[PDB]
Amino acid sequence: GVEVKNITFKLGMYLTVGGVVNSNAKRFSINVGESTDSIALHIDHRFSYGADQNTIVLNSMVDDGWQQEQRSKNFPFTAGEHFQITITFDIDTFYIQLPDGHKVEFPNRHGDEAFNFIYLAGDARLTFVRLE
């Protein structure tokens, strides 16, 4: 998927990602961190991934190893349709605004103040990234 590197996404900023879910999507993720092996925030939108049907799975990855999962069954996503998601954070917590007023919080496990890497993976097409 699309990898955005050498950006500065730090305290007090927001990041919005727009995309269109593919027609027969299985899943797509948005990822914020340092690299494909260091991810502070993985938001996996699972349409049908094993036992996870219309479920968001959140995690972090450290040295290419997945940590402890969190799940949400609020799933305002539809195959073939546009979405926007907005992320902000402080040293404690990521705040994720999903479509249709849904919201998920996920811990900022290392208390990082800035990230340099954003990555959209799987069954969605990027339409835009806005960061300020």
Ligand X SMILES: OC[C@H]1O[C@@H](O[C@H]2[C@H](O)[C@@H](O)[C@H](O)O[C@@H]2CO)[C@H](O)[C@@H](O)[C@H]1O
Residues that bind ligand X (CB under 6 A): 42, 44, 57, 59, 66, 69
Angstrom CA distances, 46 to 18, 34, 90, 111, stand at 17, 23, 26, 27
- Contact residues for its own copies (CB under 8 A)? 1-8, 18, 125-132
Q: Could you tell me the smallest distance in angstroms from the CB atom of residue 57 to ligand X?
A: 5
**What is the β-pairing status of strands 124-131 and 15-21?**
antiparallel
Question: What is the C-alpha to C-alpha distance for residues 29 and 117, in angstroms, rounded to an integer?
Answer: 14
Angstrom CA distances, 128 to 15, 45, 54, 70, 118, stand at 11, 18, 23, 26, 12
Question: What is the C-alpha to C-alpha distance for residues 29 and 90, in angstroms, rounded to an integer?
Answer: 21
46 binds, among ligand X, its own copies, none (CB under 5 to 8 A by kind): none
13 binds, among ligand X, its own copies, none (CB under 5 to 8 A by kind): none
Q: Please, which residue, 15 or 42, has the CB nearer to ligand X?
A: 42
Q: Could you tell me the smallest distance in angstroms from the CB atom of residue 35 to ligand X?
A: 15
Q: Please, which residue, 64 or 113, has the CB nearer to ligand X?
A: 64
4 binds, among its own copies, ligand X, none (CB under 5 to 8 A by kind): its own copies
Q: How many residues does the chain have?
A: 132
76 binds, among ligand X, its own copies, none (CB under 5 to 8 A by kind): none
